[PDB]
Design a binder for this molecule. Structure first.
Ligand SMILES: OC[C@H]1O[C@@H](O[C@H]2[C@H](O)[C@@H](O)[C@H](O[C@@H]3[C@@H](O)[C@H](O[C@H]4[C@H](O)[C@@H](O)[C@H](O)O[C@@H]4CO)O[C@H](CO)[C@H]3O)O[C@@H]2CO)[C@H](O)[C@@H](O)[C@@H]1O
Length: 224
């Protein structure tokens, strides 16, 4: 690895991306730890991984290590033209409680801290070990050439929209996240003209299990 980010909130940034050992829920674990590794910054993308083992509190997320696209504040979603992104990943085992997911926060306040927002949009690419998304299953949605199960609910005051694969995982994925925002704006009244982009990330929520390793073979994200 080029960098080993094993401290709580170990951080790297470069090439318009950032990488965080985001062990935000670690105090709910009885034992374990996790490290996030920068493997490369080749070809306008990021190559990274995270190794972990967590025990205790199986319904509690211990971490969401991620790679994020750095963004300027104040980009109203309505005026974002495109958010084209691709990811190729693997997990070394699937007998774990964990996901792989894009995470996007938006807020009316353009300076909202990156830990949350008024709304959250997740695009899940894996669902391992019987974990649940936020909220309840709403309906199926056709976007990005796939069918998704849309779940909706609340995490505190934040409205959360999660798009899940009906079955299996998606280890090689590309989409334009604006298609997902457009679907929510039209059919769910999502206030895109009032909402500012806060974060734009992909990573793995880790609940329990391991030793396990998530490898991101490549991540690219653009914003126009
Ligand atoms: O940016 C560098 C600084 O990082 C600071 O740590 C922050 C971190 O940047 C931020 O990304 C993190 O946010 C977490 C967030 O990932 C998580 O998201 C949940 C979401 O709430 C939930 O609805 C959904 O189901 O899952 C998501 C993924 O798990 O939410 C939690 C709690 O709300 C956020 O905290 O927060 C970190 C701090 O907790 C460092 O503090 C700083 O030192 C460093 O410079």
């Amino acid at each position: 690895q080029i960098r080993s980010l094993c401290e709580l909130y170990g951080y790297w940034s470069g090439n318009g991306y950032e990488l965080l050992n985001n062990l935000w829920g670690k105090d709910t674990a009885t034992s374990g730890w996790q490290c996030t590794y920068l493997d490369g910054t080749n070809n306008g993308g990021i190559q990274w991984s995270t190794a972990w083992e967590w025990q205790g509190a199986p319904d509690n997320v211990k971490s969401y290590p991620y790679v994020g696209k750095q963004i300027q504040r104040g980009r109203k979603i309505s005026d974002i033209n495109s958010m084209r992104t691709s990811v190729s990943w693997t997990y070394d085992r699937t007998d774990i409680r964990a996901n792989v997911a894009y995470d996007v926060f938006t807020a009316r306040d353009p300076d909202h801290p990156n830990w949350g927002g008024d709304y959250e949009l997740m695009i899940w690419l894996a669902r391992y070990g019987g974990i649940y998304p936020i909220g309840t299953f709403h309906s199926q949605v056709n976007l990005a050439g796939r069918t998704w199960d849309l779940w909706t609910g609340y995490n505190g005051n934040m409205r959360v929209y999660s798009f899940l694969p009906p079955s299996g995982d998606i280890r090689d994925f590309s989409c334009d996240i604006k298609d997902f925002f457009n679907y929510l704006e039209r059919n769910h009244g999502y206030p895109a003209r009032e909402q500012n982009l806060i974060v734009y990330q992909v990573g793995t929520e880790c609940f329990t299990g391991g030793p396990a390793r998530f490898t991101c073979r490549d991540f690219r994200a653009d914003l126009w």
